[PDB]
Every structure is written in C-alpha cells, then in structure tokens.
Design a protein around this ligand. Structure first.
Ligand code: HEM
Ligand code: HEM
Ligand SMILES: CNCC#Cc1cc(F)cc(CCc2cc(C)cc(N)n2)c1
Ligand SMILES: CNCC#Cc1cc(F)cc(CCc2cc(C)cc(N)n2)c1
Ligand SMILES: C[C@H](O)[C@H](O)[C@H]1CNc2nc(N)[nH]c(=O)c2N1
Ligand SMILES: C[C@H](O)[C@H](O)[C@H]1CNc2nc(N)[nH]c(=O)c2N1
Ligand SMILES: [Zn+2]
Lengths: 409, 411
C-alpha cells in the first residue's frame, strides 16, 4: 500500500505515498484497466466535508494546521454553508486552489511550472461584454509580445446550474472549419460543428483556411454572444523550414497561445465552469497532432510530395521522415519569431525532474503515461521508460458537457 | 454488462462483452491505475475448477459442449487429479491452449496471426541435451531460410516446483554484453549479467560486439548446461542504408529470429515453465529499441555525427532525424536479404483489423495501449487513436522470476 515506481533506463526507484490521499475514482477495477479511455448540482450535504478537506490542506501548506485561525476559518465556512447553501473562497485560497489544480493535472507534462501561475480573479463579472474584457486582458498578459506567461482567469462559481458562466469555445484561439460542396474540408475539421454554431448564431465567416474564430460567451445562463478578439492581440507564426525554401508556399501558420477554455475547475467542493487557462506550446502539439492527424489538417501527403519521397510503400517510412521535418520547422519558426515554445525532448526531461521533486517534497506525483509520452519519438524521451501511477487528487480540472447540448435556448 | 470503446480518428464504436470472462486481476483499483507498471506450488484444491473451465472452453470451441466426449474427459481429468494430484493434456488441448495464450496476450500487436502457430510437443524430453536438440529443430523450422514461420516448443510441465524445466536465456538468440574495467560496455548492455553467468559456467567468450550467446538449459530441476547453437542455424542480416553508403561501415548486424524463452505458459491450471516461442520482427524493435535506447547499443550519436546534423541544440531534432534513418536501414536490409519483417505502419493497421474482427466474432480483444503503440511516430499509426480495454484471460503467458535467483545448486 506504499507503492514503488521504477525508471527502467536509470534504475531510479521512487516510493509513492501521496496516492493514499486520493479520493475520486479512476474508472479502473481489479478486473479491467481503462487506462486508455479518453473520458471515463451539489446539495448542502456533500459540501462541508469537501470544504473541510480543502481548508485542512491549505492551512497545512502554510504551517497553520491546528491553529486558531484554522479553526476559525473552518467555523466561519461551516456557518456560511449552513446559512447560504454555499460559500466564498478568500483570494489566498483561490490562488492556492488554482495552482494546485494544475499541480494535480495527471495528463499535463508541463507541471514543473505549476507554482508560477498568474491568477486573475473575475468573480465580480456579470455580463458577456465584461467576460470579453477579462478575456482580452488575459490574452494580452499571457502573450506578452511572445514571451509567454502562464495565466488563468476565474469567472463566478456555479450556483443552481441555471446561472452558469461558460465559454463556448474549446480554446480561446482556434481556426474555423467548413465542409465544402466539393465534399472536402476547408480549415480545421475539428471545429466544423462549432463554426456552424457561430454562423447559425450570427457570425459572418471569411471562409478561409486559417480564420481565427470569434468568442462565444455565456454569462449567468443567458444566450451566448459573439465577440471578435482584436487581431493585434492574436500572435501568429508563419511556418518556414530552415532548409526547404519551398515550405513557405504551403501557406501554413499557427497561433502562439494555447488557451483551454472549456474545462471545469473544482476547489473545495465549489465549481468554476468558466476558467480559461493558458501556457505555451510543446512543439509536437502543433506539428504532430494539429498538422498531421488524419482528422485534422492532414498535410503529410502534400509535404512528402514536395520532398519527392517514395510514397509507394509504407516501409520506406516516408511519413516518418516528413513528420520530423514538419516538426523541425514549427520549432524553427517560433524560435525565429521569438515566441516561447518547448521541444518534446526538453519538456519531458523537465517532467522527470519535476517528478523527482514531487516525490521528494510531496511523496508523489499523479501521472498518466498514455498522455505524458509525446506522439512522436516516444522511446527516445525519458518519460517512456518511467513507470507512473495515475490517481485523482483535488483541487482539479474536469471535463464538462458542451454547452449547446445543455443550454435551454 | 457491456462496455464501449471508441476510435477517435474514425468514430467507430465497439462493444466489449468478453471482459465478463476475465478472472486474473490487473493491478488497478478504483483509486489507482497501474497501467504503466511493467510487472505485477499448486494443490489439488484450486486445480480442478481451473481444469474444468479450460475444458469447457475447449469443448465449446469444437462445438461439442456437454457431449459425452466432454463429460467423459471431465470425469477422466477429475479422477487423474484426485489420484495423481495433476493431469496430462491431450495433444489437441495443448495446441488449442498454446494458440489461445497468444490470442490472449494483450501486449502483442502481432496477434492477427494467432491461429497459424506451429506447436512442437516436447513433453517427452528428459535431459538438457534433449532440450538442445528440440530447440535446434525449432530454430531451423522457424527460420525457414528467411521465410519465417511462427512456432512454439513446449517442454514438460511443473510438478512440485523442484523439478522445473527452464531455458535460462531470455531469448534463444541474443548478443553478449561485456563490462570493461573503464566502465564502458562492449556488445549489448542488456545482456551483461547473463553473459557473466555463461562465462562463469565455462563459456569461452570471443569478446566482440556481436557474439551470439550459448544456450543455458535446465532439465528436471538439475543444474543448467551450456550448448552452442550451430552457426549455420543463426540467420543474421548486415545492416546497410539505401542512400547512405557510410552506414555499412558502422559494422552493424542483427539476427533474424525473435524467440522469447523466459515466459511461463499457463493452460487449465498447468504450468509450462519452458516454452520458447518465435515469430518475426517489427522493424522498430530493432531500429528504435535495440539500437537507440540509451541503455542498449545507443548509436544515435555516431549516426547523427556521420549525417552531420546540428547536434548542439536538442530542438534541432537531430535525434528524431537519425532515428528515422536507422529504422529505414533495418527494414531495407531485411527486405533486401529476403528475411521476413514488418514495418510499424503495416503492423498496427493489421492489428486494428484483427481487433475489430475479434469484437464481432469473440465479443472483445484485450489490449494494452502502452505496449501496442509503437515507440516511434505514435500518433500517425491508427492504434494511437484507438481506445483499448486491458484484462486477463486464460490460457496465458506470464512472467516468472529469473532462474538464477531461485535455483538450488547441486554442484
Ligand atoms: C506552461 C506550459 C505548458 C505546457 C508545455 C503544457 C503541456 C501540456 C500538454 C502537451 C498536454 C497534453 C494535452 C493534449 O495533448 O491535448 C497538457 C494537458 C493538460 N494541461 Fe498542460 N501545459 C502547460 C501549462 C498548463 C497550465 C498553465 C495549465 C492549467 C493552469 C495546464 C493544465 C493542463 C490540463 C488540465 C491538461 C489535461 C486536460 C485533459 O485531460 O485533456 N497546463 N498540457
Ligand atoms: C508473428 C509475428 C509477431 C510480431 C510481429 C510480434 C510483435 C510483438 C511486439 C512488438 C511485442 C512488444 C514486445 C517488446 O516491445 O519487447 C510483442 C509482445 C508479445 N508477444 Fe508478439 N509478436 C509476434 C508473434 C508472437 C508469437 C508467435 C507469440 C506467442 C506464441 C507472441 C506472444 C507475445 C507475448 C506473450 C508478448 C508479451 C510481451 C511481454 O509482456 O513481455 N507474439 N509482440
Ligand atoms: C477530447 N479532449 C480534447 C482536449 C483537450 C485538451 C485539454 C487541455 F487541458 C489541454 C489541451 C492541450 C492544450 C494546451 C493547453 C495549455 C494550457 C498548454 C499547452 N501546451 N497545451 C488539450
Ligand atoms: C522482463 N521482460 C522480458 C521479456 C520479454 C519479451 C516477451 C515477449 F513475449 C516478447 C518480447 C518481444 C520479442 C518478440 C517476440 C516475438 C515472438 C515476436 C516479436 N516480433 N518480438 C519480449
Ligand atoms: C485513445 C487514446 O486514449 C487517445 O488517442 C489519446 C492517446 N494519448 C493522447 N495523449 C495526448 N497528449 N493527447 C491526446 O489527445 C491523446 N489521445
Ligand atoms: C514504463 C513503461 O511501462 C515501459 O517503459 C514500457 C512502455 N511501453 C513498452 N512497449 C513495448 N512494446 N515494449 C516495452 O518494453 C515497453 N516499455
Ligand atoms: Zn488501470
């Protein structure tokens, strides 16, 4: 019950005790492992133990467990729940909860940065225009002229489920997708449904292959509203190769800021349904997944052709060769334009160091191998040879239904 | 109960019912997933239900469930267990068993081939010399001059655990590794400890970078004995690159036959502790893992040097670049010498078709994503996008401890 993890490249063995503090379910049982499954209104009852657990770890973290300030705060929240059917976090607790939600994100390879997160308190927001303002300020702060900085903006918490704040976009910045009469796909096929709901809601699209989508913002349970992000706030990078001068004519570009906006943040039982956060890209997210997934921009074939590779037989590894060159260019382009990016070798080495830090100072680090190992060159990165234990700690980020499936219109 | 898996590239959804016939445990709980963890003496008591379940499975597959043949066999096995505390499998049951152990191996991406396994019955073997002979015949058969054929050889089952048959080699064909006084390694670093044992047992080592190890064979719980596989039986492939002529000068080669010899075969509660099996290679096993793991031959740097890549910054992806060229060379060399090999694109595509077939005809296909996805170019293969369920079915292949850690020496 005190578990060991081994690195098979280095024989380093770590002992995990942090998992004993876990609480939520994994999806797995002793008869079946669901490790590769993508996705496996609270009453007054459920709330106070949740608050208590959180406050206990918060006051522990500032070395005031069993202090009178601790007992008093527990007292105050207890009477506030008994009274108001909910409670409000102090600023200090909010910042702690958000930083620890990132710390606990088992699928995130970038967590060595977890304690340097800028938290923007937007709990005073009441309207979609106000949400837009907070989001523009977030985007500008985080982008920082290419020197990216981690940030999260937190909108008001769920009350009765009918007054929910939601960002309808999956990320703050993404490209539109249109299914053409031809039958093909112009732009990002992953965003076809959402692009429809923008047009079917009022948007007028340029119908190009890299059009930045508008924000669709929902405040207090109302109908969502369209806003265009000021183009000067959206930092983009043209993609060039340091060797193939024909690479330009492909016409590729990508945005600098990865900013997830559809997740749910849980802290001490409270639910924050609108909590966009951003960091900086790992190169493979763009070059491997965005550009070379068959259900995305799927450019492999075209690039292979311009390299004049033998595409007759799969065993010539022409896909593999092109894949590497595409990813060299993404990194090269960002680097040249001085926009923060990390390669998968550096990021995974960072994560190993973070793991050893967490095992030493916290007794563990929940981690999902299936998501942590990069989508190219897996076994030449150190995380491939690293055993990992996956379990759920709170505060946490969780998935939630798409709004258009839920919103009573 | 029912369970659904989804392919996120194609949106194909499958329904698993086979998991209901799962018995052994996974290591996971509702509170922790052990999915990336590498690793997890039997009485009359537990044995007859294990036998009964196996015989029910067998007679079902041959459309004879509940027949008098079925009932007589159950009664016969029952009496034999109560009388002798164990029992013997018929040839037909053994063949069925070995095939289904492969069919059930959730870490194996090559299972589309499972029904075409050649099973060699070596249960009459009594000495290490006899084991050597059976193993030579297996290697000749399986190699087939480069037209590889899947096979398995099955030695006598465990009795009291004091009389085990064991092949001490992890694979039948492997290169020696030697630790030098300056701390460097000559040959395959993975095999240093085993090489040391062989030498201690009296092997005269050539001490080169690709020396084929001797077989170390244990019969009936006796001390293991050393044997050299006849060189004319060990097919090897010199590694060259189709565009880079300097690649041959690196002096690389590899053997053609992947043959695992340290696993345990469990069938109807019986335990076969020596059961070498062989197939053919997927290119990445050699090109990515054997050559490029830091803890193996580790040739990324010399290859990258000769390609004159920018090796200063890792963001040049000089490692990824060299890795691809090496895997091109491995496939090119095998194909050119007409030795059976499959690339990771072909193999994963075949596995997806296998898996879908198994869902329709069998109700499921247990699979371990962590092992099925290839160690390079993961997401451009179709298995990356495929949800999989992992559970344990019997008959099965299992890990067992290394024999040098458990053996009682006679002297
Ligand atoms: C600063 C640099 C960061 C890097 C390089 C990074 C990297 C990544 C990557 C590569 C993934 C895999 C996701 C995918 O493949 O789609 C991921 C997942 C995730 N990241 Fe990070 N991240 C960073 C910052 C952050 C921040 C600031 C937060 C929150 C405050 C965060 C929270 C998460 C969460 C919750 C997931 C998994 C969500 C899911 O299950 O889909 N990350 N990250
Ligand atoms: C015919 C071609 C075959 C191919 C291409 C193939 C491929 C593979 C690969 C790539 C692995 C992962 C191994 C590693 O990364 O070290 C594996 C594992 C495995 N294979 Fe297959 N295999 C084949 C035939 C067979 C046969 C004939 C058997 C048994 C009768 C078998 C049983 C297994 C088992 C039990 C594992 C589990 C490995 C472990 O847990 O250590 N395979 N196979
Ligand atoms: C069906 N599942 C869809 C999804 C998803 C997703 C969720 C996440 F939380 C982060 C990312 C990757 C985006 C990202 C975000 C940040 C903050 C940094 C980074 N490098 N990448 C993807
Ligand atoms: C501690 N672990 C020891 C081990 C092991 C092992 C077991 C296996 F079942 C297969 C392979 C991979 C070798 C292999 C075997 C076969 C039959 C085919 C193939 N392509 N590769 C390794
Ligand atoms: C089915 C499988 O779980 C799915 O394809 C996962 C695999 N690993 C992943 N890993 C990351 N980082 N991101 C992903 O989207 C996925 N997809
Ligand atoms: C820690 C992790 O389980 C380990 O490195 C695994 C990952 N996946 C693998 N997959 C295959 N096919 N072979 C392996 O040896 C491994 N090693
Ligand atoms: Zn699991």
């Amino acid at each position: 019950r005190f578990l060991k993890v081994k690195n098979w490249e280095t024989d380093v063995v770590l002992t995990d005790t942090l998992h004993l503090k876990s609480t939520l379910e994994t999806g797995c049982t002793e008869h079946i492992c669901m490790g590769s499954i993508m996705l496996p209104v609270r009453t007054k009852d459920q709330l106070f133990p949740l608050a208590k657990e959180f406050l206990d770890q918060y006051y522990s973290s500032i070395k005031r467990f069993g202090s009178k300030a601790h007992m008093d705060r527990l007292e105050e929240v207890n009477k506030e729940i008994e009274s108001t059917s909910t409670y409000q976090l102090k600023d200090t607790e909010l910042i702690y909860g958000a930083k620890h939600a990132w710390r606990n994100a088992s699928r995130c390879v970038g967590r060595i940065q977890w304690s340097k997160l800028q938290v923007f308190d937007a709990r005073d927001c009441t309207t979609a225009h106000g949400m837009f303002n907070y989001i523009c300020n977030h985007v500008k702060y985080a982008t920082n002229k290419g020197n990216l900085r981690s940030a999260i903006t937190i909108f008001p918490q769920r009350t009765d489920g009918k007054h929910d704040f939601r960002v309808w976009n999956s990320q703050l910045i993404r490209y539109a997708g249109y299914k053409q009469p031809d039958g093909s796909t112009l732009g990002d096929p992953a965003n076809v449904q959402f692009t429809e709901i923008c047009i079917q809601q009022g948007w007028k699209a340029p119908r190009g292959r890299f059009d930045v989508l508008p924000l669709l913002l929902q405040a207090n349970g109302n109908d969502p509203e369209l806003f265009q992000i000021p183009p000067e706030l959206v930092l983009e990078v043209p993609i060039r190769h340091p060797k193939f001068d024909w690479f330009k004519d492909l016409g590729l570009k990508w945005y600098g800021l990865p900013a997830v906006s559809n997740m749910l943040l849980e802290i001490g039982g409270l639910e924050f349904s609108a909590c966009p956060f951003s960091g900086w890209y790992m190169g493979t997210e763009i070059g491997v997944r965005d550009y070379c997934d068959n259900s995305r921009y799927n450019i492999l074939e075209e690039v292979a052709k311009k390299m004049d590779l033998d595409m007759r037989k799969t065993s010539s590894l022409w896909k593999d060769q092109a894949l590497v060159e595409i990813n060299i260019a993404v990194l090269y382009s960002f680097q040249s334009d001085k926009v923060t990016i990390v390669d998968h070798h550096s990021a995974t080495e960072s994560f190993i160091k973070h793991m050893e830090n967490e095992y030493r100072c916290r007794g563990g680090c929940p981690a999902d191998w299936v998501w942590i190992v990069p989508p190219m060159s897996g076994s030449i990165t150190p995380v491939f040879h690293q055993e990992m234990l996956n379990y759920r700690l709170t505060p946490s980020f969780e998935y939630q239904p798409d709004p258009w499936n839920t919103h009573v219109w």
